Design a protein around this ligand. Structure first.
Ligand SMILES: [Mg+2]
Ligand SMILES: [Mg+2]
Ligand SMILES: [Mg+2]
Ligand SMILES: [Mg+2]
Ligand SMILES: [Mg+2]
Ligand SMILES: [Mg+2]
Ligand SMILES: [Mg+2]
Ligand SMILES: [Mg+2]
Ligand SMILES: [Mg+2]
Ligand SMILES: [Mg+2]
Ligand SMILES: [Mg+2]
Ligand SMILES: [Mg+2]
Ligand SMILES: [Mg+2]
Ligand SMILES: [Mg+2]
Ligand SMILES: [Mg+2]
Ligand SMILES: [Mg+2]
Ligand SMILES: [Mg+2]
Ligand SMILES: [Mg+2]
Ligand SMILES: [Mg+2]
Ligand SMILES: [Zn+2]
Lengths: 137, 97, 58, 86, 99, 49, 122
RNA sequence: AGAGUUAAAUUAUAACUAAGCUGUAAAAAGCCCUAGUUAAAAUAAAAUAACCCACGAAAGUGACUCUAAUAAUCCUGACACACGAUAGCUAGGACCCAAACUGGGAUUAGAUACCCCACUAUGCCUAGCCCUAAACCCAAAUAGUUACAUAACAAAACUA
């Protein structure tokens, strides 16, 4: 069994389907995991938003919505609203480094949704704008 | 008048010096294949000496050639071009364990 | 391979400008350090949350 | 942003076990320093402060490297001692 | 009478040249459980592990074939004035004295 | 030697006459600069595909 | 060979490509250049999307032009290729065949550095 | 020093979708002309390479390209000459993002601070000033030696 960690380039003849779709046709689950909050949006391959759920949307409040639990809860919710609109498989894109990263991912699985590929796109400037100053002078 | 005394010659036994994989090759910004060998496939970072194992000279030539290629529009910056994924693996890094 | 020490430290002979300023002298000590005990994190949190959902619902 | 999507920092999960894929990703990013970099760019760090860090890191590395080297060199002699109670 | 120089020049230890990768003959003068202390005649003994094949054929007094790597294991470490001696030699145990 | 060398190479340069021919010529003949290395110090070339 | 012109042309059909190459080389010979050779590295998908002349480009044709030119004129040619709407992106490098390879004799191993500290007994 | 260029971010700005978003040890205030995704000029700043140790007199300099270019047949030498980090001043232009000040929110006995949010001078470009730094590698320049020889600590001791 030859299993490549690398995704299937578009120009390639490569045949893999999940429910008959190409790797490209599969919906995308965007997850922004930021230190005070985690947001999730499931979207069409064609970029029409299917479902949105955030820790705020899930009725946690200020500090509590930072935590992993919250993130997971948002995951489950997102996946429900998603499977309603009939998305079986989804490719995760994780944006940001937070307390809610992994948790919201496996919440997407817990909530009855299937994750094929998990990508990290975190902004990494190659030195654009200067970030704010350090805490405790 | 002792003939058995040692002779002040240079060491005959001394080994040759080890060579960068590229000693006396020519690194050219135009071939993205050779370059794309010294990149991380997932990130597009340039590997260090302690990975590539190059004479300082070549590590430098490689870096400069890379950056040149990347801006003249030969080679992609953020990921190793998928075509060259299956070429020979020169570098010492192991991601998957 | 160990990083080069030549030319690095500030010394009366060295032509150039320092690269390292070592906080304490680089001399191998005759003992090693003691392993750092692992920081704990909460356990069972997932199963807890699943049970709590089951309760809130029922 | 102008690059093609999904070719980079992407891992494909195998036999549906996601925890493992994620672990692999996180190892990829730790290895290339992307993680430390992300973390260090949350706040700014003024140039002198950064100079100081690099220097401390390299010292630290030299020392660990060399200590390790002496460990692996001395390692043979950990064997049961031949001369016991001489 | 033979001048010391004359002796040194013809000795087998001078004949060898560099001691890396040299096939040599050595003899086991001491044993701890799997550890064979082998005198190959140079300066320091080496120490090799008793192989799996014909383990019981290796006894104090036996003769064996070695591949010499280093005559003495020595290195300088960060911050030291002199090298450190392990007081041992580096060898690979091949088989025993095929005869 | 240099002057003779360049004397030779000059026969081959692109000029107001050769423009039409040469361009159409180069549009026919793709070249690669690509090659890879092996851990051994060996060159590997793609044209065998 | 003195300069190398790296041309990335908009990807087009045969005749229009040929035209663009022709007018480009002509401009080169008018800035006083002597053109040695014309190489075609083929048309590929560009490594990233390139925005030029109110167009966002995906593919492109690749060409090299080796030529000798008076030092003054690189700025001129550069100006010219800038405003041609058929060029995706121009660059002019000192020809890589002018620089010649010195011989790595090998890797000289660096000994650990000594006497960085005094002989003090702690 | 010039001139030209831009990959990763970021933002004006629309298009969908969601009611929240931001923010902390924890909150509040702020914003909901907000947030996520998809598209994007300008401006500014230059991941990885660098576990390298190069260039410059020093201050300084590490995206890419080209042009020009790094005094002395090489001792020392000013108050003379020419430079000189950041901040600051004058005038014109820029403004993504950061931010003294100031205004809000917390904290506290107080809080004219540390922490949160907004925003300015300023950081940028052109031209001119200003001439200061823990401008410190706290180790003057040029030739040398490893002899004699431990105040202490530090980066071993010394000759001309
Ligand atoms: Mg202070
Ligand atoms: Mg200097
Ligand atoms: Mg100190
Ligand atoms: Mg951009
Ligand atoms: Mg604007
Ligand atoms: Mg409020
Ligand atoms: Mg950069
Ligand atoms: Mg000079
Ligand atoms: Mg003078
Ligand atoms: Mg100044
Ligand atoms: Mg100023
Ligand atoms: Mg002004
Ligand atoms: Mg402002
Ligand atoms: Mg601010
Ligand atoms: Mg106040
Ligand atoms: Mg200027
Ligand atoms: Mg300074
Ligand atoms: Mg002083
Ligand atoms: Mg002086
Ligand atoms: Zn080499």
């Amino acid at each position: 069994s030859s299993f490549s960690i690398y995704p299937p380039i578009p120009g390639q003849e490569n045949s893999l389907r999940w429910a008959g779709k190409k790797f490209e046709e599969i919906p995308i689950a965007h997850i922004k995991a930021s230190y005070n909050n985690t947001q999730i949006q499931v979207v069409s391959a064609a970029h029409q938003p299917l479902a949105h759920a955030s820790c705020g949307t899930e009725g946690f409040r200020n500090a509590k919505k930072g935590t992993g639990i919250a993130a997971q809860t948002a995951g489950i919710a997102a996946a429900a609203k998603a499977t309603g609109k009939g998305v079986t498989h989804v490719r995760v894109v994780v944006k940001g480094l937070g307390p809610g990263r992994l948790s919201a991912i496996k919440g997407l699985t817990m909530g009855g949704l299937e994750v094929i590929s998990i990508t990290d796109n975190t902004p990494i400037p190659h030195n654009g704008c200067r970030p704010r100053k350090a805490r405790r002078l | 008048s002792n003939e058995d005394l040692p002779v002040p010659m240079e060491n005959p036994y001394k080994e040759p010096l080890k060579k960068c994989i590229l000693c006396e090759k020519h690194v050219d910004y135009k071939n993205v294949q050779l370059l794309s060998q010294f990149i991380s496939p997932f990130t597009g970072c340039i590997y260090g000496r302690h990975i590539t194992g190059l004479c300082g000279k070549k590590q430098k030539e490689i870096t400069k050639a890379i950056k040149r290629a990347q801006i003249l529009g030969f080679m992609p910056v953020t990921y190793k071009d998928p075509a060259y994924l299956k070429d020979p693996k020169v570098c010492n890094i192991k991601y998957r364990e | 391979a160990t990083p080069s020490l030549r030319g690095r430290l500030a010394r009366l002979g060295n032509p150039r400008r320092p690269i390292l300023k070592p906080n304490k002298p680089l001399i191998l000590a005759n003992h090693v350090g003691e392993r750092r005990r692992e920081k704990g994190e909460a356990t069972c949190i997932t199963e807890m949350s699943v049970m709590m959902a089951c309760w809130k619902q029922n | 942003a102008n690059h093609l999507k999904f070719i980079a920092r992407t891992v494909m999960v195998q036999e549906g076990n996601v925890e493992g894929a994620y672990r692999t990703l996180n190892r990829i990013l730790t290895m290339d320093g992307l993680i430390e970099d992300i973390k260090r760019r949350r706040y700014y760090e003024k140039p002198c402060r950064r100079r100081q860090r690099e220097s401390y890191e390299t010292c630290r590395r030299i020392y660990n490297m060399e200590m390790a080297r002496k460990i692996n060199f001395l390692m043979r002699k950990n064997r049961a001692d031949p001369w016991q109670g001489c | 009478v033979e001048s010391f120089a004359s002796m040194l020049r013809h000795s087998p230890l001078t004949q060898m040249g560099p001691a890396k990768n040299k096939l040599v003959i050595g003899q086991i003068f001491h044993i701890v459980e799997d550890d064979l202390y082998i005198d190959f005649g140079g300066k320091f003994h080496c120490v090799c592990k008793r192989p799996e094949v014909d383990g019981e054929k290796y006894q104090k007094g036996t003769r064996v074939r070695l591949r010499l790597l280093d005559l003495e294991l020595t290195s300088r470490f960060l911050g030291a004035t002199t090298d450190t001696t392990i007081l041992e030699a580096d060898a690979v145990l091949l088989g025993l004295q095929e005869s | 030697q240099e002057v003779l060398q360049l004397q030779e190479e000059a026969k081959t340069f692109i000029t107001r006459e050769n423009l039409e021919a040469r361009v159409e010529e180069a549009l026919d003949s793709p070249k690669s600069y690509n090659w890879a290395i092996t851990r051994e110090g060996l060159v590997v070339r793609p044209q065998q595909k | 060979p003195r300069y190398e012109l790296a041309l990335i042309l908009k990807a087009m059909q045969r005749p229009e490509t040929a035209a663009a190459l022709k007018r480009t080389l002509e401009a080169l010979m008018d800035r006083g250049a002597v053109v040695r050779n014309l190489e075609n590295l083929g048309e590929r998908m560009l490594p990233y999307k390139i925005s030029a002349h109110n167009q966002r480009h995906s593919r492109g044709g690749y060409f090299l032009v080796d030529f000798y030119a008076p030092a003054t004129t690189v700025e001129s040619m550069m100006e010219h290729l800038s405003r041609d709407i058929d060029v995706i992106r121009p660059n002019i490098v000192k020809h890589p065949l002018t620089q010649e390879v010195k011989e790595c004799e090998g890797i000289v191993p660096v000994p650990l550095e000594e006497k960085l500290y005094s002989t003090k007994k702690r």
